Amino acid sequence: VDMYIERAGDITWEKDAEVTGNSPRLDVALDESGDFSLVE
């Protein structure tokens, strides 16, 4: 068995978090392979 897991942290909301990223509204299509493409 090749692949292995290793703990990286707790799942907790952090009050001090950095705030970033925009909020785009995008038209997309999902194919049978689970791949999204822009309908643009």
Of 15 and 34, which CB lies nearer to ligand A1JHN in the complex structure?
34
Token output for 14:
């952090």
Of 23 and 33, which CB lies nearer to ligand A1JHN in the complex structure?
33
> Side chain identity at 18, as an amino acid letter?
E
- Asked if 35 interacts with ligand A1JHN (CB under 6 A), we say yes
**36, β-bridge pairs:** 30
> Minimum CB separation from a copy of itself for residue 40, in Å?
9
Token output for 30:
């999902």
Q: Which residues sit at the interface with a copy of itself, rule CB under 8 A?
A: 1-14, 17-30, 32-34, 36-38
